[PDB]
C-alpha cells in the first residue's frame, strides 16, 4: 500500500512482506526511512507481530482550514492524503488491527487503531514494536537530549553522529548527509505512555514506552488507539519549524468558548528566589508578601503587564522545599500573604495574580486539595496558574488505593492522565495552566485551549544556578527541537546579566542584551514573562520599550532562515486583539557562540504598506562574555522591497518592531 503527500514528494509504502507489517518513507524518491516494524507485545495477550497480512486499504483526503483561538498563527491549513491499512492474522492467536497514515507536504503521522475483537479485554501493552529505521544513519547528524535521565527534559542538547543517540526524548531532530532534516515526535498523547526512542541495531529507533512502576507500559480495556507518531521531513531546517502537523493531528477544541484564555505578558516574584535575593519559605527575605506583591502589581499596571506570578505564597516551603511534597497546602497562604487584600488590589489595578501550585513531585497531595485550590483561585479572580512537579526522573510520588507510596515517571500513562485531569479541572474554573516539569507538548492545546504553555526544557532559570548555565547555542537548539513540540515558558528578558559577575565562567545568561529581546519573537509562547527584577528594567527603559511593545499572539509566523544549533530568524505578524491593531510585524534573530551576518529580505511585509522599523541590535563592539550590554536602537523607514543585514554578536541577537504607518 502507498500514500503520498499532496505534492508527491513524501511517499510512504506500507508492507506485509517482512516478518511483521512495516513501513518505509522516501523523500523526493530517495529512501529516508527504511523498512520499519509495526506491532505490539502484551503482558498476557498474544502478540500483534508476525504473520499479519494486509486485507484492506481505504483512501481519503483532506483539504481544509481552521481557526485557532490563540496561537502562532490564526489560520491553520490541513492538506493531506490519508490511508487506513487493515492487517489480519488468522487464528490461533490471530487478530486484526489497522494503521492510519496521514501524509502532509511537511511530514507524516500514523497511529494504530485496534478494534473490538474476541479475547481483547483488559490488556497491558508491554512493548510497542514501532520503529523508525533511518537510512544511511552512519552519515547523519543528530541534536538530542537523553531520555530516562535524572533531570527529565532539562538537558542541554548534544550534537553527535546519529548512531551515538542511544536513548532520546522527542522531538528528536537530525539531518542526513543529503541535508534533509527529519524530526520524530508524537501528537495527541492521551491515556497512553510517552514514547522515548531507543536505538537498537544501528539507525533503528524503536518506540520505548515509559512504563508504570509495576513494569507494564499501557493499560487498556478493549478497543484502543495509540497517539500519532510523527515524522517531519524537509529540505531545510526551517521547514520543520513552519509545519502545523502537530496541531493538525489533534482533535478540535472541546472547551467551547475559550475567550477567557488571555495571551499576554507577565512579571513575577520569582527570579529573586533563583538568584537568592529572596526565599520561597518564610523569613526576613520571603518573596511572597502582600507588600512585595502590591509593588509588582503597581509596576505591572504602569508598564503594561497582565499579571504577577508569585511563588512561595502557600505554606510548605520552609526548610528544603524539594523535600516538602507531602506537606504543601494549596489553600492556606503564609501569614504575610493576604490573598483577600491582593484580590481587591487586583481589581483596583487591573493586574491579576497568577497562581502557583508546586507539588515537589507528590501528585496525590496535590490531587486531594486540587478542587479546593481552584475554588480558592476562582474566588480570588485568578485566571492562570503555574504548576510544578519538581522531582528526579522516575520519582513522581503517588499514594495508591491501599495507601502505599509508588514512584512513577513524569511521562508514563499515569502522569499523562494526571496532567490532563489538572487541565480539565482548571478549565471548569476558567483557569489556564502553565505546566513546569510537564509531559512534553503533543499539540493538546488545540483540544484544550487553556493548556497555554509549559516548560519541559532548560529555560532561563538554569542561567541563575545551572553550573554551567545554558550555552550560547542553547536557543538555536531549542528552536529546532523542543520548540517543534509547541509553546515554551522560557521566561526571557533578563536585563541585569552581571549579578554573578561577567565573563564566561559564572552562572548568568551567556548572551547579549539584544539576544534577550529577540527571545520574545524567537520562542513562541502565548504568555511571555519579563523575568527580571523590576528595578533592572527601570535601569534600561529604552531597551525595555521592546518588551512593552511586543505581542504574544500572532496571526502569522514564518521562520525565515536558520540552522540547527547555529541560528534562527523569525518574522511574526501580530494578531488583532486588545491594544494590537493586527498591522505590525515583528522579527527576532539569535545566534550561537559565533558572531553571524544574516541577509534578510523584508518581503514578508504587507505589499504597498510603509513601516517604521524599530531595530534593537547588538552594538558595534558587543560580545557576550565581557561586553554584553552594548546596544543600538535605530528607526528606519522600510517596505516589502527592502532588505536587512543582521549583524549578530557572539551569542547575540536582534529584535525589530515593524510599525505599520497610517
Ligand atoms: C527550581 C528547580 O529545581 C530543580 O533543579 C535543582 C536541582 O534539582 C538541584 O539538585 C540543584 O542542583 C543544581 C546545582 O545548583 C549545581 O550543583 C549543578 O551542578 O547541578 C544542578 C543543576 O542541574 O539546583 C537546582 C535548582 O535549585 C529542578 O530540576 C528545576 O526544574 C526546578 N525548576 C522549577 C521549580 C520552581 C519552584 O516552583 C520554579 O521557580 C521554576 O520556574 C520551575 O521551573
Ligand atoms: Ca524547571
Ligand atoms: Cl522537565
Ligand atoms: Cl539561554
Ligand atoms: Mg552552532
3D structure, described in words:
The chain has 2 domains: 1-253, no CATH class; 254-662, Alpha-Beta Barrel (TIM Barrel), CATH 3.20.20. It contains 12 helices and 38 strands. Strands 6, 7, 8, 9, 12, 13, 15, 16, 20 and 21 form a 10-stranded antiparallel β-sheet that branches. An 8-stranded antiparallel β-sheet has the order 1-2-3-4-11-18-17-14, with no helix packed on it. A 7-stranded parallel β-sheet has the order 29-28-25-24-23-22-30. A hairpin with a 3-residue loop joins β31 (554-563) and β32 (567-574). The longest helix is centred in the middle third of the chain and has 17 residues, at 363-379. A molecule of 3 linked components (GLC-GLC-AC1) binds at residues 151, 154, 270, 311, 358, 388, 390, 436-437, 455, 461, 465-467. Pfam families: GH97_C, GH97_N, Glyco_hydro_97. Keywords: Calcium, Metal-binding, Signal.
